[PDB]
Structure 1
Amino acid sequence: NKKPVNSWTCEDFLAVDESFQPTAVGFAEALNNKDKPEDAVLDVQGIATVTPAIVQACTQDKQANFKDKVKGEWDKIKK
């Protein structure tokens, strides 16, 4: 799918090759985090921790918005 990522559903995400799921999550997270991009830091551990929890959350709610599942899982890595 060449759909813009913010339009991906959880279903679209599960279709990406396994080795690249953390990349799709990192991308969605950074694109929508919207804190100043000049201060944006790569949180490898955060992305690695949330990815399986996202594949999990996504499997249980295939039609949800992918970008939205990322934010909600990422809202447990800081809060």
Structure 2
Amino acid sequence: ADAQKAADNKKPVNSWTCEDFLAVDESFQPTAVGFAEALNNKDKPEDAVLDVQGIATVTPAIVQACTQDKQANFKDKVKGEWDKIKKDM
């Protein structure tokens, strides 16, 4: 859809900085991390059962972390926050 963020397909989740994560409401920021990872772990929704606890644990990570660095690169924020959650051990 076009009446959001900037435009349909012009600043996508593999082409723009973390400032574009703060354009989205709290209602759909968990969906913003959702789409970038959902499409990364299956091609079609025949294997979609949702990843609720993952999304709900990771929501307060990218939400803050994209305000910590608006100029941070695409996808590296979801990777870096998942690393802070698991890989930090």
Q: Considering Cα pairs closer than 8 Å and 6+ residues apart, tell me whether 1 or 2 has the greater RCO.
A: 1
* % identical aligned pairs: 100
Give the C-alpha shift of residue 9 in structure 1.
Answer: 1.3
Structure 1 stretches lacking a partner, 5+ long: none
Structure 2 stretches lacking a partner, 5+ long: 1-8
- Larger gyration radius, structure 1 or structure 2: 2
Per the normalisation by structure 2, the TM-score is: 0.67
- In structure 2, the CA distance between the partners of 1:8 and 1:33, relative to structure 1 (3 Å rule), is farther
Per the normalisation by structure 1, the TM-score is: 0.74
C-alpha distance in 2 between matches for 1:49 and 1:30: 16
Q: Indicate the structure with greater helix content.
A: 1
Aligned residues: 79
Give the root-mean-square deviation of aligned CA atoms: 2.8
Q: Is the 8 A contact 1:10 1:64 kept in 2?
A: yes
